[PDB]
Design a protein around this ligand. Sequence first.
Ligand SMILES: Cc1c(C(=O)C2=C(O)CCCC2=O)ccc2c1c(=O)n([C@@H](C)c1ccccc1)c(=O)n2C
Ligand SMILES: Cc1c(C(=O)C2=C(O)CCCC2=O)ccc2c1c(=O)n([C@@H](C)c1ccccc1)c(=O)n2C
Ligand SMILES: [Co+2]
Ligand SMILES: [Co+2]
Lengths: 382, 382
Amino acid sequence: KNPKSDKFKVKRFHHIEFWCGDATNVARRFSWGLGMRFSAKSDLSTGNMVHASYLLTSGDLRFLFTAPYSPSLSAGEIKPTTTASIPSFDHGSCRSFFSSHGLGVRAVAIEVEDAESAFSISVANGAIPSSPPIVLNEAVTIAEVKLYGDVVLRYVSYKAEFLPGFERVEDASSFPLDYGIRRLDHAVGNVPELGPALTYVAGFTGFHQFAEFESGLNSAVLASNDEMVLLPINEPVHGTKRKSQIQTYLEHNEGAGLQHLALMSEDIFRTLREMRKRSSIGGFDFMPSPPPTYYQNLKKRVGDVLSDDQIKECEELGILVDRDDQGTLLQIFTKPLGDRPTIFIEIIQRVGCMMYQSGGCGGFGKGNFSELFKSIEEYEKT
Amino acid sequence: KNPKSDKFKVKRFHHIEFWCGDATNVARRFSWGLGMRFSAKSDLSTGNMVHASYLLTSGDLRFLFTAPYSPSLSAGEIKPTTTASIPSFDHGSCRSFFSSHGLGVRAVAIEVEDAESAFSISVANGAIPSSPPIVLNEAVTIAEVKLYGDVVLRYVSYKAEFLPGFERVEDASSFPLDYGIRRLDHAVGNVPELGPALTYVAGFTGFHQFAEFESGLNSAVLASNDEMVLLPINEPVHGTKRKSQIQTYLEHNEGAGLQHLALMSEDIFRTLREMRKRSSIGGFDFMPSPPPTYYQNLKKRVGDVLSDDQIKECEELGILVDRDDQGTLLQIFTKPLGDRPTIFIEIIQRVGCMMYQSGGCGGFGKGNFSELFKSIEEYEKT
Ligand SMILES: Cc1c(C(=O)C2=C(O)CCCC2=O)ccc2c1c(=O)n([C@@H](C)c1ccccc1)c(=O)n2C
Ligand SMILES: Cc1c(C(=O)C2=C(O)CCCC2=O)ccc2c1c(=O)n([C@@H](C)c1ccccc1)c(=O)n2C
Ligand SMILES: [Co+2]
Ligand SMILES: [Co+2]
């Protein structure tokens, strides 16, 4: 049941901003590893004396990488005279974020009808303000509230090309890489206590709990009216036969933050082939694959959805499969994206729920905890 | 004339250490962009709770990338009980270095006969100590003195595999990339005042001035006894028809630091082909190429050294050529390696001075300032 209680009009995920020490090297690594092209820039060459920001895109997916310059370059500036293209940026906030958490997501940005109204309504409904609404070139409005830890939810609204002050990247440095990734499906937070986290976010957005049904976690999913913005949140479950990956995250991240970005592919087979070819030459590594017992057990589970050849293609690529009441989910997880065992990426593709495909079709793979556990015990005894 | 005045026995360049915000992403980017393989690691998986350090190698060239973890992981440790594999490492020093300078070289490491003697002798002769000699596993000794700015000269000596506590990297993540780079030829500092810089370094090493003969700089080169360790230093020359790149460096770097690393290739043609193929897919960009007039003028200059086909191969790749009394130098420069217009890399190959090839054969390309200037004026008027 979807009560459609959004307190303001929400469209889709707009972009994800990483706060970096060096945006150039992170962005180039991500570009090669995920097959995203360099689409826009805001840096010294565009007049920005405050921060370096590089935008990668794949389909509708937008990854922004931002790092501060020396404050001495902009020492004479004040906010009214700033050359920053992202007015919410602050050197001290950025350095403190990165020193505290390492490389990770600062901003989960969603496009809304009117960022000013969304901001005012959110704060009126309990949201902690982070950056007030600011109009860029009388054309784009941006505002920010706290989401969890030091992650903000950023609202973006357009009167009618990424952001004013960003320049389109020259087609020469813009190699048209594409491994099939098309959009952000969901963005997941890790928190010490799930209850207060949910109550707070659902409080100021009107987002509703999304339908569901010892793995180290409890989780719940908040969704916008059309369930195209999906914000799962996890908390740890302490004490087991293995340590909670949520607890490990909080320890190495120095508290709550974004755990993983799930990127929808138009062809998860080709995406995973391309990413796996590049793992050891600058790209991303993937978690250890399930044993062959997991893939034998797939026939009994999704044999109606996936042919024997497509199941064997999942096995060759380490792809996991779960299923819902209405849809089927293919998923796989990278190793952590940086030095710390904190943020990682999920690649997914959803099968079913045709109406356009409805959001969350197939769930989030929670049934793969037991299915993975069972297959691992079976392969050991085998 | 080489007076051979080294105050201690110096062997060769050993490694270069970069201080990073995220060592993983910088190291993966450098690996792909330069064709260096992952050879050793010291991180959480090896028991290091203090810093993440990844070693890339190509031939004898060793690039180390190090970033701090959260201090909370090692809060109970003291230096006698440290899990750091590099005992000179300090969280606060590392974060302060990176916040101040951005991504850059912290340590220029040279192998010596006895790091303890080299340290004591250096400090006795004016060197400012940075980290005292420390014996690792009764097998490797390391010590550090200040070189310029926040760059240290690191001494390493071996009784008889990179460093104790580093683990060899699994041949699976160790893809055997190789674009032909073989060793560090020279490492270059930018300082506000050349005179005091030279006097200080030559004072404590015994390194001698290396033979030479408005471009924005003055420079001089310090060399070890066999002239295989080469340390040029630059200072700006203020006021011209263009701003000094040395001054730009000091401004964006917040003072003195390492300007460029020059990497010798066994085949600069293949190195530049491989690096240029990768520039727009995660690798490194190169400075703008000289006009065709520069390459026509090459026949009159090096036509005895390089055939017409090899000169045309230089033109296709943007390679610069200079010549000495005894040798010929092929060189090219990357764009800056990170966000700031500070550190860059030079690729070089030297022709001549056969005895083994003697160090510095062909010089450092100083004649290419005028040759580039002339050809640029000629191409404009053409
Ligand atoms: C993150 C994830 C999800 C996931 O997407 C997700 C949501 O979107 C929202 C609901 C909560 C949630 O979890 C689903 C299945 C996963 C994993 C996952 O992380 N892991 C590995 C990597 C692991 C488990 C334990 C300890 C260390 C690693 C899995 O095995 N499964 C099977
Ligand atoms: C660094 C360099 C060297 C070099 O290696 C070097 C040494 O090893 C020691 C002696 C001093 C020195 O300079 C040689 C030639 C160079 C460059 C160089 O940097 N440039 C570009 C990039 C540039 C010039 C001006 C303003 C901006 C950029 C050149 O054009 N030439 C021709
Ligand atoms: Co997920
Ligand atoms: Co040089």
